């Protein structure tokens, strides 16, 4: 039979059968209970709208993501999300399909063990396998080397790989991602008068960020230009009218990636953690990693980031090496495409964690040889 390549993510759940080009169903991972009282009788009001249904009734819900930073903080809601994904968005019972979840690097063990225990006890799948979210993104590019920066919505991690041999001592995981950029944008919009507070209006700020923000090639020059002319002010129409005008908030929101001091984080930007991740590698594979830097994940879709990052790394790196940044147009679904490719391989067909194996060793089987 065919395998189910699910990809929990944090912000958008992407799923679909193995062997295709794009995920079959992509929908936000939010579960929102209603918060008001409700007076109409017999309206058929449910107790929790999940997935894309709660992005249409969000006016009277309190949306809450079940995955904070890679890790899962609310297991009941995550179980509800998985149940919805299997039964309503794909309509395939899990009793007859292997599953291939994905997990960020350096995550707590208990999260992974609970994930496998749920998949084997509640949904009762035949066999499931957990894979690191960066190796898949490297599969999708058709490479076999390269250092991949997978800046998702929950957590940004940077896994270097050479000739198929991952370097476990050079993984640099940073917890700045799309959600913190949304919060920072929502916080700097208040400097013009627009106040978004409700958890429903966070979605509106996210839409503003997606449609308007861009990464500046040079920050100081853009700050000077936006403060003199008015060629940058782009307007946007809220879900009820009252258009708003975003000035130099456009390139200040995604600039937080390269200067995490804006949101008070100490660490260095995504332009310098990649160079540090390279320098921890051996001295003889640094040229190949320099030449095959891969971008993935949703947050790396800002217009103009593949040039800013290349300029920064070229500034840091030695002058002789060639710096090349691979930015495929299908960046958002790169991890899932790689997952489909991996699940479609014949050599991989014996790496699944078969159910009888789980019955013999318990949920701690995932840390064992079947990784």
Partner 1 sequence: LGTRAKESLDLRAHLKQVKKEDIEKENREVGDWRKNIDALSGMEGRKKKFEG
Ligand X SMILES: Nc1ncnc2c1ncn2[C@@H]1O[C@H](COP(=O)(O)OP(=O)(O)O)[C@@H](O)[C@H]1O
Contact residues: a second copy, CB under 8 A:
34, 36-43, 45, 57-60, 132, 135, 138-139, 144, 161-168, 198, 200-201, 204, 237-242, 282-288, 290, 317-321, 342, 345, 347-348, 351
Is residue 139 a contact residue for partner 1 (CB under 8 A)?
yes
> From CA 285, how far away is CA 292, in angstroms rounded?
11
Cβ atoms 118, 367 nearer than 8 A: no
Pick the closer one to a second copy by CB: 95 or 240. Answer: 240
Please, which of residues 46-85 interact with partner 1 by CB under 8 A? Answer: 56
* Contacted by 6, from ligand X, a second copy, Mg ion, none: CB < 5 to 8 Å by type: none
264 binds, among partner 1, Mg ion, ligand X, none (CB under 5 to 8 A by kind): none
Query: Any contact of residue 345 with partner 1 (CB under 8 A)?
Result: yes
Stated length of the chain: 371
The single residue among 4, 6, 14, 17 that binds partner 1, judged by CB under 8 A, is: 17
Contact between 294 and 149 under an 8 Å Cβ cutoff? The reply is: yes
Residue in the shown chain whose Cβ atom is closest to ligand X: 298
Single out the residue of 23, 146, 297, 338 in contact with ligand X (rule: CB under 6 A): 297
Element (H, E) at 334: helix 334-343
Contacting residue, 144, 198, 221, 364, with partner 1 by CB under 8 A: 144
- Return phi, psi of residue 145, to 5°: -125, -170
Strand partners, 163: none
Contact between 339 and Mg ion per CB under 5 A: no
Bridge partner residues of 174 (DSSP) = 156
CA 78 to CA 72: how far, in whole Å? 8
Distance between CA atoms of residues 305 and 260, nearest Å: 16
Question: Is residue 293 within the footprint of partner 1 (CB under 8 A)?
Answer: no
Report if residue 23 touches partner 1, rule: CB under 8 A: yes
The least distance separating Mg ion from the CB of residue 150, rounded to whole angstroms, comes to: 6
Our finding on whether 274 is near partner 1 (CB under 8 A) is no
Q: Does 239 bind partner 1 (CB under 8 A)?
A: no
- Pick the closer one to Mg ion by CB: 138 or 246: 138
Exposure class string for 205-236: b at 16+ Cβ within 10 A, else e? bbebbeebbbbbeeeeebeeebeeeeebeeee
Q: How far apart are CA 132 and CA 107, in angstroms?
A: 10
* Selection from 30, 276, 319 nearest residue 153 by Cα: 30
**Contact residue for Mg ion among 70, 152, 160, 178 (CB under 5 A):** 152
Beta carbon nearer to partner 1, 266 or 284: 284
Stretch of residues binding ligand X (CB under 6 A), selected from 9-17, 84-92, 191-199, 238-246: 9-17
* H or E, element range at 64: strand 61-64
Does residue 23 bind ligand X (CB under 6 A)?
no
Question: Of 100, 299, 312, 338, which lies in the binding site for ligand X, with binding defined by CB under 6 A?
Answer: 299
Strand-pair category, 127-132 with 99-103: parallel
Count CB atoms within 10 A of the CB of residue 242.
Answer: 8
Cα 139–Cα 144–Cα 149 angle in degrees, nearest 5: 65
Q: What one-character DSSP code corresponds to residue 363? A: G
Q: Which residues bind partner 1 (CB under 8 A)?
A: 16-24, 40-44, 56, 139-140, 142-144, 337, 340-341, 344-345
Q: Which residues bind Mg ion (CB under 5 A)?
A: 9, 152, 335
């Amino acid at each position: 039979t065919t395998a189910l390549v699910c990809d929990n993510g944090s912000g958008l759940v992407k799923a679909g059968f193995a062997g295709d080009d794009a995920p079959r169903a992509v929908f936000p991972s939010i579960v929102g209970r209603p918060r008001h009282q409700g007076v109409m009788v017999g309206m058929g009001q449910k107790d929790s709208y999940v997935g894309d249904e709660a992005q249409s009734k969000r006016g009277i819900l309190t949306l809450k993501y079940p995955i904070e930073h890679g890790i899962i903080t609310n297991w009941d809601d995550m179980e509800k999300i998985w149940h919805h994904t299997f039964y309503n968005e794909l309509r395939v019972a899990p009793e007859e399909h292997p599953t291939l979840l994905t997990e960020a690097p350096l995550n707590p063990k208990a999260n992974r063990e609970k994930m496998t225990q749920i998949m084997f006890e509640t949904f009762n799948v035949p066999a499931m396998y957990v894979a690191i979210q960066a190796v898949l993104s490297l599969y999708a590019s058709g490479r076999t080397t390269g250092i991949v920066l997978d800046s998702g919505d929950g957590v940004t991690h940077n896994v270097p790989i050479y000739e198929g041999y991952a370097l476990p001592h050079a993984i640099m995981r940073l917890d700045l991602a799309g959600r913190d950029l949304t919060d920072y944008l929502m916080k700097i919009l208040t400097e013009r008068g627009y106040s978004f507070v409700t958890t429903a209006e966070r979605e509106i700020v996210r839409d503003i960020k997606e449609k308007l923000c861009y990464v500046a090639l040079d920050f100081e020059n853009e700050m000077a230009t936006a403060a003199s002319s008015s060629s940058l002010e782009k307007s946007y129409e809220l879900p009820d009218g009252q258009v708003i005008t975003i000035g130099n908030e456009r390139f200040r929101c995604p600039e937080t990636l390269f200067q995490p001091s804006f949101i008070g984080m100490e660490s260095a930007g995504i332009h310098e953690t990649t160079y540090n991740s390279i320098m921890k590698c051996d001295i003889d594979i640094r040229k190949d990693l320099y030449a095959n830097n891969v971008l993935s994940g949703g947050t790396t879709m800002y217009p103009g980031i593949a040039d800013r990052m290349q300029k920064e790394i070229t500034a840091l790196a030695p002058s002789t090496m060639k710096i090349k940044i691979i930015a495929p147009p299908e960046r958002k679904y790169s991890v899932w495409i790689g997952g489909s490719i991996l699940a479609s391989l014949s050599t991989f067909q014996q790496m699944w964690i078969s159910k009888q194996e789980y019955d013999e060793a318990g949920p701690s089987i995932v840390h064992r040889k079947c990784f």
